[PDB]
């Protein structure tokens, strides 16, 4: 089997991407944030504290003839941005782009933190990291991908995120028309439960490539590119007037600037992030200070190849017995 679904930016800045997901019988379609940095499929629901729901579409398990309470199971998750959610668990039928999994754990939120409430466009998350990070207790549950894997034509999914435009998540096949040149594959460590890999270096604009190993994670659920302070300083030094602002919470730059590109290495291959992908617009409405899309990972504890990086590539998440990651230009 295969599946193919379009993923759509939630706003004009590509702060996140939503993908429609069918849950239950008859189908209830929710727009979920596909997140290769976590492993829980959780939804706003009829059980979510009413004051914490503000415009989201909810899953109502009592209206699904295939929903079953997973007795005694609870979940609770905290994300790198400080947001969180928790609740109980149902199993139900879940379909993505024509690919159907029966008996998928659908984690129903009883509580969500303010940032989720405040984002009306995201009805929940669909985790695509390794199932070892799933938070369901006392019986850990599998991701949608893990459940689908054996039925797939090939045990892979691909992320093709757009810049200010829709893109695609495919399951079970590689669309050879969706990228240019060849796909370069690179080793993955699953030791921390992430799609963790080592970039071979970077360049700023038309500058020379610096060969240096940068361990980090391919994370579709993080907006920006978080890299070591040395790398980030070298990037922003090429933008007149750019500075790190403790009050704003990162590097800012004059909105009048033209940003240089940023290249990262995948083996001997190179992925070029155009300068415009690095512009996240005014820090506040009407400001001439703009927020940068490359930020320091210092104090996160891990480097994160988030959407800024991933949307410059066609990315293969290869879930073979030994997982790997592939990157192509597009």
UniProtKB/Swiss-Prot annotation:
Its EC number is 3.4.23.22. The active site is at 35, 199. GO terms for molecular function: aspartic-type endopeptidase activity. Residues 17-328 form the Peptidase A1 domain. It is an enzyme of class 3 (hydrolase). It catalyses: Hydrolysis of proteins with specificity similar to that of pepsin A, prefers hydrophobic residues at P1 and P1', but does not cleave 14-Ala-|-Leu-15 in the B chain of insulin or Z-Glu-Tyr. Clots milk. Disulfide bonds join 255-290. Keywords: Aspartyl protease, Disulfide bond, Hydrolase, Protease, Signal, Zymogen. One of its GO terms (biological process) is proteolysis. Belongs to the peptidase A1 family. This is Endothiapepsin. It comes from Cryphonectria parasitica (Chestnut blight fungus). The gene is EAPA. The chain holds residues 90 to 419 of 419 of the full protein.
